[PDB]
Amino acid sequence: VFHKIRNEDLIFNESLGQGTFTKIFKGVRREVGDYGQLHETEVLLKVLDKAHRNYSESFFEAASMMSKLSHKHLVLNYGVCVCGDENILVQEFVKFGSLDTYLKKNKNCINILWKLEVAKQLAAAMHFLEENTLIHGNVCAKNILLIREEDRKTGNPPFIKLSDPGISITVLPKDILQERIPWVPPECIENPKNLNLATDKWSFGTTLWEICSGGDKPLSALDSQRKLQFYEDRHQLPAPKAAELANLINNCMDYEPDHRPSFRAIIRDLNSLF
Ligand SMILES: Cc1ccsc1CN(C)Cc1nc(N)nc(Nc2ccccc2)n1
C-alpha cells in the first residue's frame, strides 16, 4: 500500500493541466527526511475528479503495483493523500516534464542519437516491467518524463522515467479508448479485457513514432470513427520524416499481438543502429 500523506502537509499551487478524469497541480510537501532533516519538497499532485470517484480504485491500484518495483527509469511516487473527499497521488516533480511537450519545444535541437538514447531507456524500463509480468497499459510520450537534459558539454545523455499507468483501459469508457487510438492496440479496441503484455509493445511503437515526430500526435487529424476504421482496414502509421526507427515502429505495431517482439529483442535492435 502507498504511504499516507496528510492533507495538512501538502500545499497546492498552480494547475498544470489535466489527464483522463484527473486534474494535475504543482505543490509542496513538508516532510521529515533522512537524519531528521526537515524538507519542503516540490511535488506533482494528481487529483482524481470527484465526479469520477468511482475510478479511484483503478487509478491507484496500477500506480501502487508499479511503485512496488523500484527502478531507475520508473517514476517515484511518494504516496497518496486521502485528502477528505479527494483522492490524490503525490509524485516526484520532474524538472523538464513530459517528453511530448519537450519534443515540440526543442524539435530543432534533438537529433537521432538523443532519440536513440531515450528509446533505449524506455525499452529498458519496459523490459524490466516485462520480466516482472507487469502491464503498464498507457505507454505514450506524455508519460515519459525528462529528468535531465542532454549535456554534450559533459557528454551526459538525457535521462527519462516512465510515469504511472493511470486508470486502466479495462475500465475506461469506450469513447476514451477510441480517442487513444493508435496507442491503445487493436485487440483492446476489439475487447478491453484483451489487455496483455503484448499491449505495451504496440504502445511502445506508437511512442517511438512520437519521439521521432517532434511531438506530433499520430492520427490526430482523424476523428474517433475514422480511427476505428483505420484499425479495421489494418493501416500502419506513416514513417516519420526521420525514418531511422520506422522499421522498429512497424515491427512493434504488429496487428498480431503474439508476433510483437520481446523487449530484449527490441533492445538488441536498438543497439544495432548507428
Ligand atoms: C504536468 C501534467 C499535465 C498533464 S498530465 C501531467 C503529469 N505528467 C504527465 C507530467 C509531469 N509529471 C511529473 N511527475 N512532473 C512533471 N513536471 C513538470 C510539469 C509541468 C511543467 C514542467 C515540469 N510533469
Residue numbers in the entry: 536 to 809
Give the original sentences from the paper that presented this experimental model.
JAK2, like other JAK family members, comprises a catalytically active C-terminal tyrosine kinase domain (JH1), a regulatory pseudokinase domain (JH2), and a Src homology-2 (SH2)-like domain that, together with the N-terminal FERM (N-terminal 4.1, ezrin, radixin, moesin) domain, forms the major receptor interaction moiety. The JH2 domain has a key role in mediating both negative and positive regulation of JAK kinase activity and numerous disease mutations locate in JH2, including the prevalent hyperactivating JAK2 V617F in MPN. Previous studies have demonstrated that JAK2 JH2 binds ATP and possesses regulatory autophosphorylation activity on Ser523 and Tyr570. To gain insights on the compound binding modes to JAK2 JH2 and to analyze whether any differences could be observed between binding to WT and V617F, we determined the crystal structures of selected small molecules with JAK2 JH2 WT and V617F.
Our diaminotriazine hits share the aminoanilinyltriazine core structure and were confirmed to have JH2-selectivity over JH1. Diaminotriazine compounds 23–33 were found to bind JAK2 JH2 domain generally with selectivity over JH1, except for analog 33, which bound JH1 domain more effectively than JH2. In general, the binding of diaminotriazine analogs was stronger to JH2 domain of JAK1 compared to JH2 domain of JAK2. Data in the present study and that by Jorgensen group indicate that aminoanilinyltriazine compounds might possess slightly (2- to 3-fold) stronger binding to V617F than wild-type. All compounds anchor to the hinge region and extend towards the Gln626 gatekeeper and towards the G-loop. Overall, the binding modes are highly similar between WT and V617F structures and no major differences can be seen that would explain the differences in the observed IC50 values.
